[PDB]
Paper text:
The AAA+‐ATPase p97 (also called VCP or Cdc48) unfolds proteins and disassembles protein complexes in numerous cellular processes, but how substrate complexes are loaded onto p97 and disassembled is unclear. Each subunit of the p97 hexamer contains two AAA+ ATPase domains, D1 and D2, that form two stacked hexameric rings enclosing a central channel, while the regulatory N‐domains are positioned at the periphery of the D1 ring (Zhang et al, 2000; DeLaBarre & Brunger, 2003; Banerjee et al, 2016). Most prominently, p97‐p37 regulates the biogenesis of PP1 holoenzymes by disassembling a regulatory complex of PP1 catalytic subunit (called PP1 from here on) with its partners SDS22 (also called PPP1R7) and Inhibitor‐3 (I3, also called PPP1R11; Weith et al, 2018). Disassembly is achieved by threading I3 through the p97 channel which is speculated to strip I3 (and SDS22) off PP1 to allow PP1 holoenzyme formation with activating PP1 subunits (Weith et al, 2018).
Here, we have analyzed assemblies of p97 with its p37 adapter and the SPI substrate complex in the presence of ADP‐BeFx by cryo‐EM, yielding a set of structures of p97‐p37 during the disassembly of the SPI substrate. The density map (and EV2A–G) confirms a staircase configuration previously proposed for p97 and yeast Cdc48 (Cooney et al, 2019; Twomey et al, 2019; Pan et al, 2021; Xu et al, 2022) and conserved in other AAA+ proteins. Both D1 and D2 domains of p97 are in the staircase configuration with subunit A on top, followed by subunits B, C, and D in a clockwise manner to subunit E at the bottom. The central pore is filled in both ATPase rings with a density of an extended polypeptide strand that is engaged for threading via interactions to the D1 and D2 domains of five p97 subunits (A–E). In our structure, all N‐domains are in the up position which brings the substrate complex close to the central p97 pore. The SPI complex on subunit B is seen very clearly as an arc‐shaped density enclosing a globular density, corresponding well with the available X‐ray crystal structures of the PP1‐SDS22 complex, in which the leucine‐rich repeats (LRRs) of SDS22 form an arc around PP1 (Choy et al, 2019). Surprisingly, our structure shows a direct interaction of SDS22 with the N‐domain of p97. Closer analysis of this interface revealed docking of a short helix (aa 337–346), located C‐terminally of the LRR array in SDS22, to the groove between the N‐terminal double Ψ‐barrel (NN) and C‐terminal four‐stranded β‐barrel (NC) of the p97 N‐domain (zoomed‐in view). In our structure, there is extra density on the p97 N‐domain at the SHP box binding site underneath the PP1 complex, which well accommodates the p37 SHP box segment (Le et al, 2016). Of note, the UBX domain of the adapter cannot bind the same N‐domain as its interaction site in the N‐domain groove is occupied by SDS22. Instead, we see a UBX domain on the adjacent subunit with its N terminus facing toward the SHP box peptide.
Author numbering:
A (entry chain C): 266 to 400
B (entry chain B): 21 to 773
C (entry chain A): 401 to 762
D (entry chain X): 215 to 225
Write the structure that this text describes.
Amino acid sequence: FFLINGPEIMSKLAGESESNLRKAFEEAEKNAPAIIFIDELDAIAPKREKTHGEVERRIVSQLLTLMDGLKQRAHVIVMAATNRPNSIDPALRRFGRFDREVDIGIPDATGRLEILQIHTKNMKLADDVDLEQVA
Amino acid sequence: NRPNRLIVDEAINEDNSVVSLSQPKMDELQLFRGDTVLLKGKKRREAVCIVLSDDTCSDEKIRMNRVVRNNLRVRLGDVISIQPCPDVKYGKRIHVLPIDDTVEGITGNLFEVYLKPYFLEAYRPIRKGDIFLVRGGMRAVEFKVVETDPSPYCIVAPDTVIHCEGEPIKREDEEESLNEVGYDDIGGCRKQLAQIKEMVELPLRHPALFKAIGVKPPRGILLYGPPGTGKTLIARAVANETGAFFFLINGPEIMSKLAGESESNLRKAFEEAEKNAPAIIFIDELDAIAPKREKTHGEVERRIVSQLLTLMDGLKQRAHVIVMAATNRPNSIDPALRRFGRFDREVDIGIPDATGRLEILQIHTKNMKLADDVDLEQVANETHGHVGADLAALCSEAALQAIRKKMDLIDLEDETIDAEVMNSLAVTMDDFRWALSQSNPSALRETVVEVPQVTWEDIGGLEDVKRELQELVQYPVEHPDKFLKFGMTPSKGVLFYGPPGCGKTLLAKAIANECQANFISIKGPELLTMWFGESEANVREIFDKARQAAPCVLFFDELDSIAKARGGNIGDGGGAADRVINQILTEMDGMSTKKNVFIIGATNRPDIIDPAILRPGRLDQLIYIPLPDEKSRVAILKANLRKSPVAKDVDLEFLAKMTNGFSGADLTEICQRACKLAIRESIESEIRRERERQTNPSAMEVEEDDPVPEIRRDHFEEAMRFARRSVSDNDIRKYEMFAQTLQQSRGFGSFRF
Amino acid sequence: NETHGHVGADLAALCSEAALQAIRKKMDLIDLEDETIDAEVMNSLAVTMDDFRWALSQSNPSALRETVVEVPQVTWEDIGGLEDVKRELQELVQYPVEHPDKFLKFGMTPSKGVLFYGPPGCGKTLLAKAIANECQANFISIKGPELLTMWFGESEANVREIFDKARQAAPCVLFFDELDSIAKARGGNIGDGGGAADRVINQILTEMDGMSTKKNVFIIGATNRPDIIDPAILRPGRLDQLIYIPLPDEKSRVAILKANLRKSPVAKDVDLEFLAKMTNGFSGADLTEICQRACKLAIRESIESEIRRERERQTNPSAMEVEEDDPVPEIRRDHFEEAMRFARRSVSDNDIRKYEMFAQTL
Amino acid sequence: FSGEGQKLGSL
């Protein structure tokens, strides 16, 4: 899983970040049926719709070219870890515009006790405490 | 067209190079029983075989075996042209290689010791590049023709020296060759496809036609539209069909850190394509290449734009050099490129129609059978018309549902997948239905929000109004032909006058849930913005998306707060509200498609309505939603009691007569109050039972938990004594004033005799 | 002469397109020619004046292709009413352009025309579209969201681009929308966006008052009522010339209703005369709405009849082919009367007074 | 993979 990073999207050179991202994608694909740990997924969010940043626009174009075109369906897939889906734009919302159609994540309190159960089981800290009951 | 393209029927004989031809076929065509003719297949698939004379095994159709179809990459019944192939001589040094996926298991020299006589004095005029499975070593070893010293169709004989190495061909190349590109997700783009072919095939297959025409075709052709919806697929299909060099050009490709690297790369690519062949400039993702050199604050970007213009717009620059330009944002087009000379041609890719939707969906689904008893055309017609890879998404969702059903009946099957169970594990219309119910338009997904489910039947009262709305929705779609025959357009601006939220917003939600088409809900404070013109731009974008998202429903909820007249107070402030109203009118007016403009009007105060959009055309009708009659009261009561446990001691009619002046919100409140009283009573009973059980051994499994699962008549009486109707006589007066305005605006029926 | 808009290699491109269309027709009707084409057909591949005309009608100016998109075209004849106004507009379009001798004899330049105080809702946009389709010349029409942007000076750039495009493609009339939304004075909406929008409006006026007085630079304006529009630059020193419009009528209403019916499946038993008589105080949008309601009732009746026929066929497979195809091919006079009864007028007396006062403000 | 370099399957 080639870990992405927002800082990796920055290039003091000309197009170096986009070329480097393309090279990383190619290296991961040629490496193995690897994964694409797409981190900071909400970085180029708006598909440069209202964005005036040409470097940002160039990055979006390179990202779409990686996500589309010939042999886009490699033996890898990316993670749409979206901080804000409204910021995100349809240029990835299509099954093929990105890896797929993305879901959303949110917390629940009933399952939180199970999450609380895991957190408590991480380190023993109570015996007679009805920790699940209180949670 | 030509009679030489005979239908490729199925051959009973298992011989690969033998086609059962009718006596009429062997006679009308120069087709002897031993004539080595050449057959041309898909994507330049040419091969030479023998034509068997079988009149009883062919009726104007070339009976072809499945091996022949697989080798030629053709289906059954295909109109394949057949031409004589007498130039097939013995190859000098033909390179051969087995297939790794097919030579896996056949040990030893499974070519010379298995297919020995298959090529020795066997007159095998196969194309250089073909793979044929050979039954050798109790298997089917396929050897791919690596190369041939002679031309592709070379007669492999004992004299022909078949060069052979130990290179086993992996099945990945087999899949890639099977991964051809045609009309599988493209339905209805006949005009664009024809234009492209004429710019290519007619340009190539009839170059003399262009020469006699005294004019070259458009070397620069632009492809606007939503990309990757098949746009990338369109480029792939072109490249697969195209025999000339396809100089694929990515967008962020030439831009490099070194000085002038991008321009040098572009010039090098152009020169290489020119010296290579009558190539086509496959400029992929060319949309983000230049902002018309006006907003191009980047000097490197400006230089890139200038170099691109010089290469494209240049004297004697594009000789037999087409420019496959693809655009995702036609607005983002550069000024010079949009003109002829830089891009002489330009095409915009539109969304497909329901018929084209069905065609593309069936073509995509041709890979599998996910419903043996269901027609995909039926669902596609039932489909709203989500376009692009929406069909692919629907297919994937149906596959996921089928996999859920199968692996639900199966184990993890990490290594032991039951092939018989895996063999067409699920082919279900129910899977497609579940996918579609779980499916929605991806474009509006960012605007999509979760809404409660309610049926048009689940809402009580206003049966005439609900029926009218449903008919308006259906007839506009269901009987488009009837509208064409009548020759009239439908209504858009349906409003609602009365106390909203009494079920009003609930009515809108129930309609949207019961709506077969899309629905876009608009909040009153939703589109406001602080940046200069940002709110108006947002409104314009929403309108444009809705127009693209046909069919859709403009649920402009809380339109009262957005529809204030320009100057409803002592003065206006900011003026952007007037700009928003003007932009809405530009959406509400103007010559365009407006294919499914279902504008939903919700306003509790009709006086807060700007007349301009309230005007006809800009507005269709307003639903003067009154309070419920005792009959309507009983209807709403029954609708509420749908999920409630009913008590026979409750006089619903007596209440409805008593609650003549009440409201649907009031009725819901009374129901909630009775439910709360019952819940409190149940909680108290449970507490008392526990306390008795706390102090003494007592039974727990008793029906006392629900002493009255139905509504206690005492609870109903208490709720009645609690509150009453919230209808205001002044509010009634205002509503009646709006109604009287409408009525005086109306008049008696014509009844002209 | 017709190809006023086409410039540069645009004419050659149009000729190539005409040749392509004609050759496509000739070959497709002649032969697929997957291998070779007939030399007789090849020598007989001459284009036709009809083919050139068809392509040119399909063709459009190169800058407009990058500028504007298409719209539903209508015929000036297809729209009834304002016959004198239509004649004046057509004269201004042609005799000032199609006749240079008229300009020489008169000398007077074409009037700018400020804002047609037209019907409030029936849409002067309808008239503008019908004229532009009839005009066969460059036509500019934009909405108010055209220039307002979160880019400093973006509106000024948009105005400059519009002016330059008009200069390139003169003559062209700017059928700009949001007439009231731009005509409002600097004050009132205190403080708007700090006056930057007002600054852009003032610059555009100066860029257009204020525009180049050559090549028949024209503009087209209209509003539901002129009172919403402030005459800040609409004064005939900054708006150059002015042209208003009236509200709808009764005889013109009958004419427009007749045109709409002619566009659709007409009926005889309908009392069109009494309908027009009752239609003295209505609007053309109201007539279109009545027509749509009647059509909806007819379609509902047809659907109900089809449902009954299908139910009978299912219940008895003998009545499938024993039904008339069009239960009401003409409009049911009962349906028209019912639609009228359910209908109401959009005429507002207070709005009429306000519009007249705005006209009276002249 | 090679052409005319290995001894071939003589018949």
